Design a protein around this ligand. Sequence first.
Ligand SMILES: C[C@]12C[C@@]34C=CC(=O)[C@@](C)(CCC(=O)Nc5c(O)ccc(C(=O)O)c5O)[C@@H]3[C@H](C[C@@H]1C4)O2
Ligand SMILES: C[C@]12C[C@@]34C=CC(=O)[C@@](C)(CCC(=O)Nc5c(O)ccc(C(=O)O)c5O)[C@@H]3[C@H](C[C@@H]1C4)O2
Lengths: 411, 411
Amino acid sequence: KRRVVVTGLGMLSPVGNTVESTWKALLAGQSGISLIDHFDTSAYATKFAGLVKDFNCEDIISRKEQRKMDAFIQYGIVAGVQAMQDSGLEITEENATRIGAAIGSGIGGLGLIEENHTSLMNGGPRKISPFFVPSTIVNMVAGHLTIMYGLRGPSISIATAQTSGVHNIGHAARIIAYGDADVMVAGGAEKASTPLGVGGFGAARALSTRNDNPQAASRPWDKERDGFVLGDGAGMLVLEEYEHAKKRGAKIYAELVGFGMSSDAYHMTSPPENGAGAALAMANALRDAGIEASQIGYVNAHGTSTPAGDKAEAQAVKTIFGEAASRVLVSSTKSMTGHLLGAAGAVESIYSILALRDQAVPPTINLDNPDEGCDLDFVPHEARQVSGMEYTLCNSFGFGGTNGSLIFKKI
Amino acid sequence: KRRVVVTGLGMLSPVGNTVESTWKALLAGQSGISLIDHFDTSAYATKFAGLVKDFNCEDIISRKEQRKMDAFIQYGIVAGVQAMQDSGLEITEENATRIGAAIGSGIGGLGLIEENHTSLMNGGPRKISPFFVPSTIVNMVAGHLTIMYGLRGPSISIATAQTSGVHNIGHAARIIAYGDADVMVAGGAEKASTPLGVGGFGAARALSTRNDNPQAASRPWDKERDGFVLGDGAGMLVLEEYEHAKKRGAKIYAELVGFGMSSDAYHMTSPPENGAGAALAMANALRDAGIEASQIGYVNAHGTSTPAGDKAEAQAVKTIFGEAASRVLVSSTKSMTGHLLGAAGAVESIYSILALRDQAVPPTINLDNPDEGCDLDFVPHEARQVSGMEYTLCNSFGFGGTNGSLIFKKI
Ligand SMILES: C[C@]12C[C@@]34C=CC(=O)[C@@](C)(CCC(=O)Nc5c(O)ccc(C(=O)O)c5O)[C@@H]3[C@H](C[C@@H]1C4)O2
Ligand SMILES: C[C@]12C[C@@]34C=CC(=O)[C@@](C)(CCC(=O)Nc5c(O)ccc(C(=O)O)c5O)[C@@H]3[C@H](C[C@@H]1C4)O2
């Protein structure tokens, strides 16, 4: 009966270009939200986002190859390299077959979609790049990485919008636990800070508009919430079978204990007031881990800072925790990080891991005035030390009412 | 130990708007390839594709809701309804939780991407539709369908480009076999016959250019091959646990016996001459099914009619079959159907099923002059009756060297 453990991490976030730097920033309650400058935001109702600062891949990706890939792919490859390195794993002809990847994204190569389309409109199909398809499609991070590292085991790419990160990690673990693979690099990558991404979610009325204070915009559960904030980044974890990792003396961050999925069956871009769907997703992860809601010390909420969304998740926590409801710590890193969409669940799974290694829980900043009727401990303003925390749970929910929860156990 | 069976089918193809009509057409060796008329193809090097003829959803989707979804979503929903109906399954409050979906697509809502982008370029972010995101993203078919049918179990969407259909079906079966679900609607949907899809794959030099004979264009293994042909469609199958299906007296088309995945780790848009990757994918499906290459009576090849691609797959068959190499029937439905990308593996999984029900195997049309050095029986020109065939295998390969194989067993 195969157990899965995390033996490698990598990340690119609006608050740091490494795992450690990003963790540091979050515990210090820093914000990565800034004003956009790569395109004219005049007509845009939202003019800020959590961007990746001074990105550099020169040492990892030839500017020759960079031409064949959208920022989202570029990000994910870098985070994947970080993870592969940090794992210390060495690919051998024996190995190849039993190592793979499960990496996706919510929207994929918007930027190159826009470029290629603009080109076509201005000068015809003659102007489309031969790399249009391969540079924009969601599965390309798994593509480039399996090639770069000679990985030959199972490779998949789940695109469940804002739920992607959690699904890729969850299925990567299943692939391993099932016997199909021994190691899996998994997570997600996103870079939707484009005219289309901003204008698009902007058109749905899903974005915050607090342009006077981009850092105060993302405020989960606070009463002045006005919609989620966009974030770019990538998060990746090397998942590996317990005995395979030991046999190689791998540093093991944590164990992946439970994975749960659910479907809202309600509305395409909104959850029930009731949070029924998030509840089942958490409820199935517990049952998969074989433990009780009482044992969860920390929950990394999906908490996107949308009026209807944050309320639903809260509702669902009460429902699952009941008694403990107030004794469990809950927080949204999105208060500082922004919403990474297809990468949200990857980075947050990383934070849910480090919170067990460091027995510390990052805050929900901007939580000035909670929502009324809230019994929950949303860890507002300042990180919080914890005692004997053995399990953390991570939530991701997405459009189409698709939900997922991962449960991590210490050591 | 949970077995998975197919208890429902649905389809939209360039040769038929139902399962039965499409099967009929294929066995008769008909072609669905035609010249494009929905956009000006003057500047286009490829001017044809396998389109879905006289699509109608009026009875299933309100023109009110149709506004919120790309053709690709519209197609997939219809095929999903067909499948749900054909399964005879009835969703009950008990049920909901244990029924879900695993549906994806290669490229998603290109058409609405183009519309929305054009709008933005012509009149600003003000012109983007509030439905931009929800109408174009890959996971929306699973979204709309879980809602329409009150499905609350696990919902996922794998986007592994041209390998998608096989992956969604394969993982849907795993979800079931693992205990996460009892029923899963699974497959894929595509509609890339757009300026971007045509110009895009056209820019990669991956499309056939035989505009003088659109019906002769798709010719897997033939010596005058000139690249794949684009096809629109959707294919869906209801997968369900054996005892759950029996307990309800479900008509059972076949059993899903093996699922295999592999990664080429070679090139982003091309397979090794050696076909090493396809071999492992087939090789793992056999091992998963617990049977031998000898027992496979029919193989539905990925056979896309690209020079480098068809050769690689052939190579891989020899490698896996060896002795039997000539005693196993191999064929490409893409000779008539075109390439459905993210939906290819769904429809072809359907054909791999019916070939067991009807003990008949559809031909590879246009196979005038094989490639030299080929020992394989590619079932050229005319469908072929078969005797005691108990297993069929279905191949899907995609960009990023991602591969997958499904193995179906009679009854
Ligand atoms: C039609 C409306 C109704 C509206 C009303 C109140 C709201 O609060 C929002 C802004 C968002 C509802 C929501 O929270 N959706 C939601 C979700 O279901 C799953 C994931 C996420 C995520 O970001 O990962 C998410 O954002 C909705 C959205 C946009 C528009 C305005 O739908
Ligand atoms: C850079 C080049 C080299 C080139 C040369 C010879 C060829 O024959 C083609 C046209 C296609 C190779 C190929 O077969 N790729 C391939 C694949 O790996 C997996 C799936 C599929 C599918 O359609 O599901 C597929 O199409 C390639 C493509 C385009 C361009 C011309 O890469």
